[PDB]
Design an enzyme around this catalytic site. Structure first.
Site, PDB file in Angstrom:
ATOM      1  N   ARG C  59      18.819  10.022  39.550  1.00 10.50           N
ATOM      2  CA  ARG C  59      19.196  11.420  39.349  1.00 10.50           C
ATOM      3  C   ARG C  59      18.141  12.356  39.956  1.00 10.50           C
ATOM      4  O   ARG C  59      16.953  12.216  39.695  1.00 10.50           O
ATOM      5  CB  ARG C  59      19.395  11.711  37.858  1.00 10.50           C
ATOM      6  CG  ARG C  59      19.576  13.183  37.520  1.00 10.50           C
ATOM      7  CD  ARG C  59      19.673  13.455  36.027  1.00 10.50           C
ATOM      8  NE  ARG C  59      19.807  14.867  35.715  1.00 10.50           N
ATOM      9  CZ  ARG C  59      18.848  15.682  35.283  1.00 10.50           C
ATOM     10  NH1 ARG C  59      17.598  15.272  35.150  1.00 10.50           N
ATOM     11  NH2 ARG C  59      19.134  16.954  35.053  1.00 10.50           N
ATOM     12  N   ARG C 106      16.136  32.414  33.707  1.00 10.13           N
ATOM     13  CA  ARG C 106      14.730  32.063  33.557  1.00 10.13           C
ATOM     14  C   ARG C 106      13.881  33.332  33.351  1.00 10.13           C
ATOM     15  O   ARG C 106      14.211  34.424  33.819  1.00 10.13           O
ATOM     16  CB  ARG C 106      14.286  31.387  34.855  1.00 10.13           C
ATOM     17  CG  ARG C 106      13.507  30.088  34.728  1.00 10.13           C
ATOM     18  CD  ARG C 106      14.308  28.796  34.565  1.00 10.13           C
ATOM     19  NE  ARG C 106      14.027  27.854  35.652  1.00 10.13           N
ATOM     20  CZ  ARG C 106      13.328  28.107  36.768  1.00 10.13           C
ATOM     21  NH1 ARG C 106      12.530  29.167  36.867  1.00 10.13           N
ATOM     22  NH2 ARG C 106      13.519  27.359  37.834  1.00 10.13           N
ATOM     23  N   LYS C 251      28.814  18.373  33.224  1.00 14.48           N
ATOM     24  CA  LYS C 251      27.880  18.478  32.115  1.00 14.48           C
ATOM     25  C   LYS C 251      28.443  19.466  31.087  1.00 14.48           C
ATOM     26  O   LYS C 251      28.693  20.630  31.413  1.00 14.48           O
ATOM     27  CB  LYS C 251      26.506  18.912  32.638  1.00 14.48           C
ATOM     28  CG  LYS C 251      25.841  17.912  33.575  1.00 14.48           C
ATOM     29  CD  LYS C 251      24.607  18.460  34.240  1.00 14.48           C
ATOM     30  CE  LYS C 251      23.548  18.941  33.253  1.00 14.48           C
ATOM     31  NZ  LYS C 251      22.475  19.695  33.962  1.00 14.48           N
ATOM     32  N   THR C 309      19.570  13.248  27.802  1.00  4.54           N
ATOM     33  CA  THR C 309      18.487  14.099  27.346  1.00  4.54           C
ATOM     34  C   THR C 309      17.830  13.584  26.062  1.00  4.54           C
ATOM     35  O   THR C 309      18.478  13.429  25.039  1.00  4.54           O
ATOM     36  CB  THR C 309      18.890  15.590  27.305  1.00  4.54           C
ATOM     37  OG1 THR C 309      19.458  15.941  28.565  1.00  4.54           O
ATOM     38  CG2 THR C 309      17.743  16.525  26.965  1.00  4.54           C
TER      39      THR C 309
HETATM   40  O1  OXL Z   1      20.782  20.636  31.015  1.00 11.06           O
HETATM   41  C1  OXL Z   1      20.972  19.495  30.574  1.00 11.06           C
HETATM   42  O2  OXL Z   1      21.271  18.517  31.234  1.00 11.06           O
HETATM   43  C2  OXL Z   1      20.766  19.282  29.080  1.00 11.06           C
HETATM   44  O3  OXL Z   1      20.751  20.272  28.369  1.00 11.06           O
HETATM   45  O4  OXL Z   1      20.714  18.120  28.687  1.00 11.06           O
END
Ligand code: OXL
Ligand code: OXL
Ligand code: MG
Ligand code: MG
Lengths: 497, 512, 512, 513
Positions: C59, C106, C251, C309
């Site tokens: 990744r 950000r 995601k 994560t």
């Molecule tokens: O941004 C991401 O991939 C997370 O929050 O896990």
């Protein structure tokens, strides 16, 4: 085909969703065995019985001569082969010999006497006060207070007895000694002659009467010898000992008949359903054929329509999971033999649609052992596929039938079109539920590949002509990797051409 | 009691473990309904029927007069009360009125004409032939037949055994060909499957019969040929205020009734699967589908269902049933029928007592063979959640009954309802329903596992003692009947206060 | 071995009671391992050791780094991978995944020192740019120019550790109270739970990164902050014709994405449960609900799902994971994740190799602990009836695999599809997917149980011989990998004709 | 609410697909929270806030601290607890747990000094007491005098929660080891010797002193460390004697032997702790989840309490929010069916002890709603033996009723706890309000999932019936005040037929007044 009911999460909801307006599929999976006799032995009647759905012709050797039975077998064959001109529409018909076995009988020109309740009747080894029977050792094995049943258990009783339930006495009536120590050999000299006759006549199966233990099954098997080694031995379980020793019997046998006539005299009538459901369940678990027999449509001997109880009984025997259902008096001596066959055909199709396949398939698989037999693995996988795509059929190329039997064990909804060139295999296949045997006559092709492809096309033509499936429908095809037997290991999912 | 089979993880293994040498418990949970007639209407025979296990006396109003039925009811009561001197051994017996409904019958030829296949027969409503039926002309009572049948239609006569096909239709006649012949007698039933039969579910005759039923204090009505909810409402309305407590059991015996079963089941107190007419009105091979469907739906609803007609038919003429008949009775109980019914067997048969005993024996065996593991789970999963504290108490008690393999569930009930709520969840153990209300004690037989007991002791002064007295009564009954013995565990259901509809207390107690 | 004693249990409870630490798992590891590549792991030597340790997918996080930096990283991954290509039997395909920056907010610059935010203190939020490099305890700049318009509201900063409540808002300005204070550094991430963002799901930057991905021949895109099906279509459209075979993994990292999960799942090739952002965007205690929901729905659909994560977070600084981390990886596999993912652990941690090895070990253990009895049943009950012959073949194969406890399922596949169809039904046995397509071999790692093998042999003239060659290749791989031995039974899936989408032949064969 | 849509699924897969983050859980929290008390949490004010946040049991770790230090801590716990005692409706019993040091191996003194061990460096290990307070980067003393006998060349030695790893290179009075994993080595760190056969007694002389102190301090339960066999549990029980006979013994399963002999230990114990810290060093870390799930399953089957312990929210020692893994771990321990979850460093020494307690409370309530009760209740039922115990039959029946009517609570009158434990075994969704007059029973009850203990202070009434009704009414008031149920809601009430213990046999379904 009760698909709405088949998708229920519970058996109760499944029952609530059974719909009389949901028609069943064209295929009928449960074999129909018909006893042949005076009412049904003519070639013309037999043709109509085959048309109506007869799969096996049962010959009852408790009666008749070798001559009478030879003529009957000839007539069955004549009727069967009358449809052989079209191999697509031909139907194999099996021949079953049912043995007399250890029958006790009392002592054509027949008179009857009236036995009265309360009256004393003496037994000796033809009228009120003296009754003769053929079991010379009766006096040794019974005591006063033991019951003696005569004429299908309708009459209930040197031997001094009191008549508890009277009636017309007749001549040469069968006797029941409820689990007395009856020493009559499971294979008498008469049975030996009948079995040998059976081997000569090229019968497909033997229904062996009053099997009580594994040794009895071995005796029958031994008598058939090398020439008869491929004849299927179906043990009739019709006494208390046979029920107690069912496991060793089932191990030794090719299949089982729940012979409810004798059984309902030998054990309390109200317990026969327990024994029936037990034997069917165990046979299903073992993958060995089980026949439900006797008095399924009894009233149709005299009436063109069955009782409500009879309709229920046939349906429940199929739901219990019988591979075959059987007619006795109904077809042998009844006034309505064709109606009886048709009625069994109709009820079986309905009951087949009403099977809760979701639970049945799961339970069957959970109780089957894990094995490294590639044919067994192929079979169960094929049945899974069959369900996954709601296939129109499972086509199985088999030489001995074994491959098709392995598929049948897992109870697919879809019919199992068993393609064989072996006539005996085509006949014997009717013992297994959902096996629709087809006898390929086409000469052997040059490439084994092409010989396989041709046999498959035969099956496709049969399924189309029978309305099992249409062009574009999906079917499952089982083949081997290598010419020969016990190498079934290839499953293909193919469109009907 | 097939406990080894009851502990199987799969239904298949359960079946494989069914053991003919495993004897059932003493208790018999499935109600037995017996049609009373010439063979069974005497006080002496009725005493023996009660002894043999009859729970409900069915009166068939298709036949007989008010006088004949009043005498029959009196005889049933006389036979019942002959056992009332011992309340521990007394058994309540219910009376059921079965309505004639829209019956079609043939005229008079005892005489019979032999119909041959292929032979022509003419049908007429002209009364000139009402008593002059023969092999050439057949009269029937349905005046409008010619309007509702067409060329090609089937006409079934005498329990569907004789079949006629309409070949020509006239103004006031039909020419028919005999497809299935046989002996044709007088006043036989006629079925017109798929015809547009225009007859009221409640005729003026039925209204008189229902009123008579209310006067005679009958426990339940079996309403014939119910086709829709409105038919059930007509019956209910006719019974009025005085008959408001009489249970209406709809007989489902035609295609329409099966198609509209949900609305009928909603409107009714219970159902009868009337398989005689049903097996003529729909293909015989479909009757089992309809039966299993109706039983399943009734069980899910917690409403009584009766399996009826030709369960032991051969026993009209023979002292022993066929193998099919044995299997049919067993399967109706396994399907989960609350009651099983005898018709010809007890009304006109040569062996009425044997038939009752045979149903009793088969029911007990089949009851032991129930896969309670699956049944109890599925029943609970298909029952809705309720605020009703009595519903929650009932289910909990059934669970406990299982957990401790209790000898019985004793229920103090005034209206029956608390015991009905227990019955719905199908405990293995018998439900001893203690009541002082005689009608409740009679009506309770409609529910499986309910063993009704009628306490005659006066109301004691301390409510708690009135409770204890009634529980002790049930303990004495269960002991005397061999349901349980001293030291055994039983479940007891009571309310927290006097009255009806306050059942909320469950206790697990030793038998004293 | 392989916890098969537990696999035989009739209940999930008994299955749990039978789990045995002394029952060692099979050699095969079915759950894919995705590793984020960064400073700690981008060297050729480290990458070789990561491949050895079990890395399946590299990744690349485009939230950071340049095209240059990523191109070099991709080159290094390829160099490390192809260093094992001299032995095709022992070669392992490695996929490259591009993870998009997506709509990120950000903070500005404080050097890279910090201010202390105090709980209860006021803070100004501004998009001025005048404070872009002058952030302090009084004013915080952020890059989302539209903030003062979408907030009315909680604002989270720095992995959700700092929390701000909007007290009063003007255009160009916003005043907040610090709810949770702490150390605030430069360029920290900002989350706006609810507070509907208008930022494009595919920014101009993302477009460039995606195009770069297509040029670099990446295998899959992990698309950040997908909220609806349209977002997935935008990603797919940007990839164009040249990128048509690249897998789009959405995601799911906010509340909207979870609410619109069905439409997203339909539009996507697969799903990542991106628990970092998701545990800020929804209450942290609800992340497990969302995870289990998404995994269950993906399994039901037969589309890959990644659990992502902080799976082994402590391993950034420690050579061993916490007990919670061990449990989390095991439960993600038991939930039925197709892949598990490392982020900081492999990108920037002190122990990147240990992290990969730990995921490999836990995954194998958890795979042996799977209740296949219930899983296979439920899978089949929720799968639709189809006329797809390949689907019917796949399920049949998985049944067979179980029935004979096969050593593997060998699948000849050109596009992956046939092996994906097998994977959906969750066989215990590894799925050896033989392909000549390198991209298919790489992409296959997204699916549980798929062990991809890349045949390099030229295409034979006789299709039968070309099939036999490829099956033999798989037999050699399975032998060399210790999946099975000579004489063992395996399942083989082939098609009836050359091409894609013709898999319909299942054979049960001995290993030669 | 309460994941009811998911709870009605026919399959576990469909149940998972129907889990909804927008479906809020009920007010009640069924899983017990155990908090290790230490420097961060021993003040009366912090303890009050911990009780408020949801702490049920105060765990005292006797691997550290003096009798004095622990006595003060126990006093503080009691002071904080009894500050709420003036209102019995809003009072919450808090249990005290003594966790034994047990057969630990510990390193010497470098007190609060540290050295840096470098990977590849040689480190000598010694039992010579001369170096007991002179440990450094070159020589490490430990208290296990027999170490050299039980370890071999190639053996691993793990130090400080397994973070430091040493490989034995040479065996002597000494071992020469190579540092495989280095790091900061402090004083008195724990040592693990995976696969060695350590002869240490399960109950050391230190443990005996600590246990006696525990009996004097009136502790509710003992967490007995490194239990390996049933005899070890009997030793602990024997040491407590007549005076301590009612103290609950929870065996910590934290080595290979304990896992292998789990059934005999489970039989001998009052309950179990899955002590994942030592366990994850003693057995491969990748297997700890197997041992956890196995022990929880078997404890649920037995109807004995099981605690999931160690590193559940570890990062919260230093951070105000847990990792995603930590959130998942807590949820999965509850889904596995732990009766209690435990905080160690998080509450003892962490910067965020209150946040940690609150986080466990939140996750537990969510996970509790997400339990597939359809399957769990059926399986529990099918695996429980048939008995003629009327209390057991009453318990299961009550749980059935609770489900049937979606009752707000099950109220249980209990003297010893047993009747409420019997209910808890069948895992009702509804909270079990256990009414007792016995304070120790009220404290000990927190070991069982769903048991919300309430301590009735009202005098015993002369009419037994009225004394029962008073206690039921007390529970009604508690459930109302706690927002478990409202007036008009249905609850289940369990009572006995006579005064005394082991007579629970009456279930009532009643409206809340
Ligand atoms: O941004 C991401 O991939 C997370 O929050 O896990
Ligand atoms: O001792 C403990 O608690 C452990 O090791 O988890
Ligand atoms: Mg016979
Ligand atoms: Mg420890």
């Amino acid at each position: 085909q009760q698909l709405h009911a088949a998708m229920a999460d519970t058996f109760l909801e499944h029952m609530c969703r059974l719909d009389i307006d949901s028609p069943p599929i064209t295929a009928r999976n449960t074999g129909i065995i018909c006893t042949i006799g005076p009412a049904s032995r003519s070639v013309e009647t037999l043709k109509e019985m085959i048309k109506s759905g007869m799969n096996v012709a049962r010959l009852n050797f408790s009666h008749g001569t070798h001559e009478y039975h030879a003529e009957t077998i000839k007539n069955v064959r004549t009727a069967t082969e009358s449809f052989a001109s079209d191999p697509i529409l031909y139907r194999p018909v099996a021949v079953a010999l049912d043995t007399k076995g250890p029958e006790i009988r009392t002592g054509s020109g027949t008179a009857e006497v009236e036995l009265k309740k309360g009256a004393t009747l003496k037994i000796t080894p033809c009228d009120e006060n003296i009754l003769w029977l053929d079991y010379k050792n009766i006096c040794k094995v019974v005591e006063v207070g033991s019951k003696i049943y005569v004429d299908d258990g309708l009459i209930s009783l040197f031997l001094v007895t009191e008549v508890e339930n009277g009636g017309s006495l007749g001549s040469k009536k069968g006797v029941n000694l409820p689990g007395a120590a009856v020493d009559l050999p499971a294979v008498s000299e008469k049975d030996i002659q009948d079995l040998k006759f059976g081997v000569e006549q090229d019968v497909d199966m033997v229904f062996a009467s009053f099997i009580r233990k594994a040794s009895d099954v071995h005796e029958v098997r031994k008598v058939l010898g090398e020439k008869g080694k491929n004849i299927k031995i179906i043990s009739k379980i019709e006494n208390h000992e046979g029920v107690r020793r069912f496991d060793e019997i089932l191990e030794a046998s090719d299949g089982i008949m729940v012979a409810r006539g004798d059984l309902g005299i030998e054990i309390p009538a109200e317990k026969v359903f327990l024994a029936q459901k037990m034997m069917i369940g165990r046979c299903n678990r073992a993958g060995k054929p089980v026949i439900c027999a006797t008095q399924m449509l009894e009233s149709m001997i005299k009436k063109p329509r069955p009782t409500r109880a009879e309709g229920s009984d046939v349906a429940n025997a199929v739901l219990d999971g019988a591979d075959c259902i059987m007619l006795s008096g109904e077809t042998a001596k009844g006034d309505y033999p064709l109606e009886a066959v048709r009625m069994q055909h109709l009820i079986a199709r309905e009951a087949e649609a009403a099977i809760y396949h979701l639970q049945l398939f799961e339970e069957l698989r959970r109780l089957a052992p894990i094995t490294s037999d590639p044919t067994e693995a192929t079979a169960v996988g094929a049945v899974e596929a069959s369900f996954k795509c709601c296939s129109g059929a499972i086509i199985v190329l088999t030489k001995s039938g074994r491959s098709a039997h392995q598929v049948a064990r897992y109870r697919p909804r879809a019919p199992i079109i068993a393609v064989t060139r072996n006539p005996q295999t085509a006949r014997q296949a009717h013992l297994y539920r959902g096996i629709f045997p087809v006898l390929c006559k086409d000469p052997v092709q040059e490439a084994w590949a092409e010989d396989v492809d041709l046999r498959v096309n035969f099956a496709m033509n049969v399924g189309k002509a029978r309305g099992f499936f249409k062009k574009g429908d999906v079917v499952i095809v089982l083949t081997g990797w290598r010419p020969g037997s016990g190498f079934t290991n290839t499953m293909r999912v193919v469109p009907v051409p």
